[PDB]
Amino acid sequence: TRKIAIYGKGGIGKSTTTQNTAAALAFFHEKNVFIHGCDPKADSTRLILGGLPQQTVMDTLRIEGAERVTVDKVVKTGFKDIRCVESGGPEPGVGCAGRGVITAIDLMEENEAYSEDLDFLFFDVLGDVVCGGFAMPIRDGKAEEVYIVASGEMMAIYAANNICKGLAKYARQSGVRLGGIICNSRNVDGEKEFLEEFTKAIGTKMIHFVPRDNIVQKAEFNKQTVTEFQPEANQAQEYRELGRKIIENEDFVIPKPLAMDELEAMVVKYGL
Amino acid sequence: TRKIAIYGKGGIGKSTTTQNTAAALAFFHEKNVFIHGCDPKADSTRLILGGLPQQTVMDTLRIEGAERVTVDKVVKTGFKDIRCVESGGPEPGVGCAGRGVITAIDLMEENEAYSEDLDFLFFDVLGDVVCGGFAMPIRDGKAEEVYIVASGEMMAIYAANNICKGLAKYARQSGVRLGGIICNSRNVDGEKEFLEEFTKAIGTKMIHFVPRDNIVQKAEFNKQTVTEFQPEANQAQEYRELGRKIIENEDFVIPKPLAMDELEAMVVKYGL
Amino acid sequence: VTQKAREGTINPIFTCQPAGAQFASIGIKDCIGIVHGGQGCVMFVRLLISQHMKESFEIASSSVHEDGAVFGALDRVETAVEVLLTRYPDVKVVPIITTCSTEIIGDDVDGLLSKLEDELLPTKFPGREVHLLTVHCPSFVGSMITGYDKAVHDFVKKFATKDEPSDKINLITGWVNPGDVKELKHLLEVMEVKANVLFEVESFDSPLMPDLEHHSHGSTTIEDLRDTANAKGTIALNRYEGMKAADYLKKKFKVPAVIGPTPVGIRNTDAFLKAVSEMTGQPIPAQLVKERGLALDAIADIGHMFLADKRVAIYANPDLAIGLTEFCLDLEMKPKLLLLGDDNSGYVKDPRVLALQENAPDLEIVTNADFWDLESRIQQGLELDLILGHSKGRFISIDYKVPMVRVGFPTYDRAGMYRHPVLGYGGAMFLAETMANTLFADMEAKKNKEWILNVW
Amino acid sequence: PYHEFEVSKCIPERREHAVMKAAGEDLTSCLPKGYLNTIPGTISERGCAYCGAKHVIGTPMKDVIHISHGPNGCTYDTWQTKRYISDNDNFQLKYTFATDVKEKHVVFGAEGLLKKSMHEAFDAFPNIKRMTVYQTCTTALIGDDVDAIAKEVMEERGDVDVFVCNSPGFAGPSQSGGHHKINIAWLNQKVGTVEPDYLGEHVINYVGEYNIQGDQEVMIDYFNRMGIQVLSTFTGNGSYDSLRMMHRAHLNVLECARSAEYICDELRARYGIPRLDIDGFGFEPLANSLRKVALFFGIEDKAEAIIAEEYAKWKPQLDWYKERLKGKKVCLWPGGSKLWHWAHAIEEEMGLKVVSVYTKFGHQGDMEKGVSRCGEGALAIDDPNELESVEAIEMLKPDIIFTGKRPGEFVKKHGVPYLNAHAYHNGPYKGFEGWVRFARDIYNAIYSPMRQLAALDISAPDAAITSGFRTAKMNADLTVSDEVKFSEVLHEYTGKYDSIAEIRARNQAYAAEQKALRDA
Amino acid sequence: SEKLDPLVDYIMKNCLWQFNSRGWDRLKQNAGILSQTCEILCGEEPVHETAMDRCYWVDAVILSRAYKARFPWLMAMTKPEIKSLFKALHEKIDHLTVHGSLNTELTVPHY
Ligand SMILES: Nc1ncnc2c1ncn2[C@@H]1O[C@H](COP(=O)(O)OP(=O)(O)O)[C@@H](O)[C@H]1O
Ligand SMILES: Nc1ncnc2c1ncn2[C@@H]1O[C@H](COP(=O)(O)OP(=O)(O)O)[C@@H](O)[C@H]1O
Ligand code: CLF
Ligand code: SF4
Ligand SMILES: [Mg+2]
Ligand SMILES: [Mg+2]
């Protein structure tokens, strides 16, 4: 099984792209996919389950206890029998959501939730990796590959660069590798060129380009993915190509982050 | 002094909107503005300072100690003499940014960084309020008003509703209130109607609509706000109007968050 | 001054801030604190106070578990206050002490106080006098010393209220034994000076009564704390255990504050009495001259015969340890090692420490020390005749055959040390004679000129 | 029926945590709840999961650096509060280690500090090659990866071994969360990683013993005399490497099933090692336990010889105290297993009446054991608080209480003497000699002349003031008959203040002899 | 009835083998130990096919010794009534320890 963690800037489309690629992998390529949402607001599997799951691992520990969490109470099955679990966590401004992710992933390991016949295990993480508990998906025994979702916007690239800085530690400790940069288009002038240049300066590749399309919004309003919504749409084929590129990926590297002066010099060609 | 905290979905434009509105407030309305960035990646003050500060409250505590932090080593001055400080914090995947924000705001109160003559103090906070340390800006003696940045995307509205849930709790402890929803447009079909419905449903209002324009990205690539880049442009006028609408705001409420079944019912007319 | 080069701890000298706040709280009458955090954070501290005093004190917990840490635990504090107030109807003061865990996750216990006072107290305890306060004690800052200092400041800030002026002074004792408070109160009573004593911990020693049960408690009242604002002045004996509260009183109510000296030994007791005399206008009377003379006669019997040139290592609470070093120098002993067991930055600026560096030639001061500082220096060849310190360094004394006099907190390996003073003239006589008797017993155990104890 | 306390009416959740044994009821009628969350503000007796893992089970290991990843306070608070001794010169009592986490390490990460602290500890104690890192509250919330650091330190040194215990204080309702965590961690990381050098003909693992005042040494002496090899002891007087060899024992001899049943059940499930629950306390329970162990190996006659010899030596002395203790009431208030280890044996062999039992952390299994072994009318409480204990004393009027130090100091101020159920008083209390030592402690506490003096009010007009002296024997002989008082076979305890010195100096002789023969 | 109460009472006051951590383990403990006790009292020599069978047997040997010492009426009954009595004893111990047990931890799937 290929265990992958998805990182990137906040609101860049980590969850949408993760769910859509999982649906494409299960539908067009007949793959066994598991999604572990690592965000306390628990919105990482709504499109696959067709509605927000109402049992997170943390809600189950709070109600029943750690010893009563079962891989049947918290793991749901959605589109194309994709298995979905949500870490859960607190409401904004209280608690430790980092510790909840640590405990949720620990509990799924102890209960052997991720099967050995899975083909893909996606850890969909939040956008603000503010503590060590949000790096739990890239520890030893967890995700071996990381894809960063970015865009041509400068703050998305800066966030992607920041994640690479923090990812050095886990590349040394657990051997996790950066598989490439997924570019979710934000309709920025010169976006393709900026992504190619940035991915080159840090030593990776832009694995796929995901167009900005409103069919994604329409499907999201309908509680499903694009693949479930409209398999023959162009956007569904874009997720089918991203999934294939992930399947046939063999470029896994340790990113070399850019000092911010290099990134400042790089963005000049695009502010014209 | 009007102390304000900005919340919203990750990457919705909180930092960009805060810096641009602060520039418009200082330039078009001649207001004394302070920005305290509460994001460990410390990118909340780039457009005002013309580049990332290299001294953060947390970097100084790490090198010299808490007792050797001064309001001169960490507080910088940028466009139209807007005073800026960054909380700082760890690189992604280590430590505790939440504690760093608690300590940074504590230190800036101890050292009287916020001068009596300030008209506005903006606490720019990250998008994933994962702990009680990122709600430190809305405790007693801190921001009395909160503006949530959202858009027509259903995840942004869901994040706004989630933030309102946490903000309802503190409204009964601290007297923090919701001043409104700022809509940073993502070009969603039905975006205006969705935002009007959602703000009415929770008891607040859309204070202003900020269009999606590429001049914002161009100015950002040039390390400045639109007001600094092009004062007479249309986007600069939008920030000036938004600044004017904040100045004249008197509608501060305790939000009524929607149960997920209500929000699911509401979004049915938008996916057509 | 040497700062410890290792970053980890081998055998810590002090515990964490919440323990200090808890110890300050048990000195107040009708006060039960709630430690907001894990159960160990309160249970171990109750055991530690029990080791020192051989008595049980009531401190409560909010009992934070995994769901409390992940989801927020302010509901635990709200429940704790309600349960504690319903089940203990005599409680008037409830301090809420935070720990490392709830300081990390940012539980807003200050804002919760406002809600409790507006909703829970008026509703479910109407007409009951209940005062709630917060003491923020992140254990990754400071130590139990800074926790105590902060809690005294917090108690004074909660209660002190301007009113009609009083002839009393404020005596903030610092972290001292019940025997120390008795000595200080005796000195004030001879001088005819009324004081608000922070804290009245003589009732820590409770009697075993025939019929009426009588538990250990503190005796400082809310009225004492309220009246701190109306005093003629504040004398804080310990700069690290009470200068914050005294500075607050000066800044807020213009109550003049005299900081130190810790009245350890003859000379520092004189300086303390002179400060009291200046503050109050009261002369030092002839009875104190006589009690001072009695202590000096005892010291003269043993001084240049047995105490001169004895090599001493000292650790204690910082103020007591520094004062003990000064007393040992006055007694002609040779202090070799002083251990200041936490990261306070004021030690190197302390005028008492600067004077020690100037005129104590063979003395090494280690700041942020642990017990491995003392032990590894002995293993490398430091020769000592005596140790002054508390009981957690007892195995250094046992294993390296250096006798130890039990001072400070906690002293659990000897009986009744909390009942003897180390302050004042009585404490000076007790200290000097205990050092001599510890040395005498050691000479007899090692047969080291033990025949000499006949015609001294 | 479920006992509700007057002091706990406002917290109705407390009703189902107490039962009173009634005639015509069995385990399926009523049973106090257990292993639940604590009610905040009750001033309960419960500790934290770090206590259960580190303080209770981990530290007893004698050749290990026990370093807590966290601030100094957790490490200080558990230092010099326990009485598990070892034949490694009590290294585990004298040296304690912390990383001393500060605020800069909280904000920026404390993994570099942990690695540096580990190297410092190994450097300062070059004869120690084993280490356990314990999580605290602080470093468990921030997400420090201790396992990665342990791997790095091991490969950098090349001759050390590190065990990782991820048991922060908040991770569980009591010490029980810690018990479970450290058992499963040791099993998964460490068991099977070392092979025994020599395997005798009868090999046991002694599980669930923590050598309080030499309790394990007492039991090792008995096993030696039956010719039984104790491969490892979990964990009192235990060495790190022997505990890595647990998978090679013929039999698991489980003493404390509250703290170590997890590793026993899993060794049984994985390696097929049978689990044999035993009692170490009492004459008859200890005799039966020795009989079972010897019977498993077919060496029963050796157990019988030990039992006859020990009965002849100690039964007359135990009966001296038993005659004087008949009918005295006791409250049995430990944390865990000692309530059901003692409840039946104390009534039978010392004549005491057990009027109440409680557990601080025990699950429903401990309570089903304790209710079974207690008489009708005994009060069984789970997760007691201080006010409940006061109410119980005023209702039951015990003559002595077995509890902790601080709870003991509390009940002292209500007139009652106490013996330390946790650390003992003049222990060890295990063995045949140990039971006699326990009986003498009970008798000394109850019949103290000072206790009657303290009950006397000298300001009362017609106060029974006397002069001279009284002895405990004078007080206790007022309760016995002439036949007992002038018995020529019953005599008081004839043992040294340190009963473990001679026992330890015998276990060591045996070890030397066995090594000699083996090496030949 | 008058035969079961002394036997059950002795087990619950003295023995520890019936208080295992999980119901599925308690069932095996009960069955093995009690069947072997019935065999011992019937004059039989139980046969062991596993090390756990031998562990069942040591408890069985101690318990049968206690039953012989304390309940002389057992050695007077014949094998059919001893079997029926121990069948009844097995049911009662199962009901007390597993079937009717209020210990909810017995169904926790992990150790
Ligand atoms: N390819 C896309 N085209 C259009 N909208 C998109 C696309 N990808 C994502 N979005 C929008 O982005 C919003 C937020 O993205 P989301 O996946 O929730 O962010 P994250 O998981 O990174 O926090 C969604 O509500 C969706 O409408
Ligand atoms: N009105 C807008 N039009 C176009 N791009 C925008 C607009 N507002 C924000 N952006 C883009 O949004 C990106 C992310 O916004 P940012 O302020 O960094 O988000 P946050 O602070 O909420 O994490 C920026 O790179 C910026 O160029
Ligand atoms: S420094 Fe507490 S003992 Fe600890 S693992 Fe948490 S419950 Fe247990 Fe100080 S405040 Fe307390 S004592 Fe430590 S946790 Fe921090
Ligand atoms: S930053 Fe991470 S570790 Fe710190 S409180 Fe917030 S969620 Fe917890
Ligand atoms: Mg997401
Ligand atoms: Mg921002």
TrEMBL record, chains A, B:
Cofactors named for this entry: [4Fe-4S] cluster
Magnesium found in the keyword field: no
Catalysis: reaction(s): N2 + 8 reduced [2Fe-2S]-[ferredoxin] + 16 ATP + 16 H2O = H2 + 8 oxidized [2Fe-2S]-[ferredoxin] + 2 NH4(+) + 16 ADP + 16 phosphate + 6 H(+)
PTMs per UniProt: The reversible ADP-ribosylation of Arg-99 inactivates the nitrogenase reductase and regulates nitrogenase activity.
Gene Ontology MF term list: 4 iron, 4 sulfur cluster binding; ATP binding; metal ion binding; nitrogenase activity
Functional note: The key enzymatic reactions in nitrogen fixation are catalyzed by the nitrogenase complex, which has 2 components: the iron protein and the molybdenum-iron protein.
Protein name stated in the entry: Nitrogenase iron protein
Species for this entry: Rhodobacter capsulatus (strain ATCC BAA-309 / NBRC 16581 / SB1003)
TrEMBL record, chain C:
Domain Nitrogenase/oxidoreductase component as annotated: residue spans: 16-439
Keyword Oxidoreductase listed: yes
Database matches in InterPro entries: ChlB/BchB/BchZ, Nase/OxRdtase_comp1, Nase_comp1_CS, Nase_Fe-Fe_bsu
Signal peptide per UniProt: none
Record family assignment: Belongs to the NifD/NifK/NifE/NifN family.
Protein's UniProt name: Nitrogenase iron-iron protein, beta subunit
Molecular functions (GO terms): nitrogenase activity
PROSITE patterns per the UniProt record, alphabetical: NITROGENASE_1_1 (PS00699), NITROGENASE_1_2 (PS00090)
Transmembrane segments: none
Coiled coil: none
Domain of life, source organism: Bacteria
Entry annotated with the keyword Ligase: no
Assigned EC number: 1.18.6.1
SUPFAM superfamilies hit by this protein: Helical backbone' metal receptor (SSF53807)
Record keywords: Nitrogen fixation, Oxidoreductase
First-level EC class: oxidoreductase
UniProtKB/TrEMBL annotation, chain D:
Residues annotated as transmembrane: none
A GO molecular function held by the record: iron-sulfur cluster binding
PROSITE patterns registered for this protein in UniProt: NITROGENASE_1_1, NITROGENASE_1_2
Protein name: Nitrogenase protein alpha chain
Subunit (UniProt): Hexamer of two alpha, two beta, and two delta chains.
Lineage of source species: Bacteria, Pseudomonadati, Pseudomonadota, Alphaproteobacteria, Rhodobacterales
Gene it is expressed from: anfD
Cofactor(s) needed: [8Fe-7S] cluster
Family statement: Belongs to the NifD/NifK/NifE/NifN family.
Pfam families, sorted: Oxidored_nitro
Keywords: ATP-binding, Iron, Iron-sulfur, Metal-binding, Nitrogen fixation, Nucleotide-binding, Oxidoreductase
Signal sequence extent: none
EC number per UniProt: 1.18.6.1
Domain Nitrogenase/oxidoreductase component: 48-446
Reaction it catalyzes: N2 + 8 reduced [2Fe-2S]-[ferredoxin] + 16 ATP + 16 H2O = H2 + 8 oxidized [2Fe-2S]-[ferredoxin] + 2 NH4(+) + 16 ADP + 16 phosphate + 6 H(+)
From TrEMBL, chain E:
InterPro entries documented for this protein: Nase_Fe-Fe_dsu, V/Nase_d_su
Keyword Transport tagged: no
A Pfam family reported for this protein in Swiss-Prot or TrEMBL: AnfG_VnfG
Recorded superkingdom: Bacteria
First-tier enzyme category under EC: oxidoreductase
Enzymatic reactions: N2 + 8 reduced [2Fe-2S]-[ferredoxin] + 16 ATP + 16 H2O = H2 + 8 oxidized [2Fe-2S]-[ferredoxin] + 2 NH4(+) + 16 ADP + 16 phosphate + 6 H(+)
Molecular function terms, GO-annotated: ATP binding; iron ion binding; iron-sulfur cluster binding; nitrogenase activity
Keyword field contains Iron: yes
Keywords for this protein: ATP-binding, Iron, Iron-sulfur, Metal-binding, Nitrogen fixation, Nucleotide-binding, Oxidoreductase
EC number: 1.18.6.1
Cofactor(s) needed: iron-sulfur cluster
Listed transmembrane segments: none
Assembly and oligomerization: Hexamer of two alpha, two beta, and two delta chains.
Its biological purpose: The key enzymatic reactions in nitrogen fixation are catalyzed by the nitrogenase complex, which has 2 components: the iron protein (component 2) and a component 1 which is either a molybdenum-iron protein, a vanadium-iron, or an iron-iron protein.
Protein name: Nitrogenase iron-iron protein delta chain
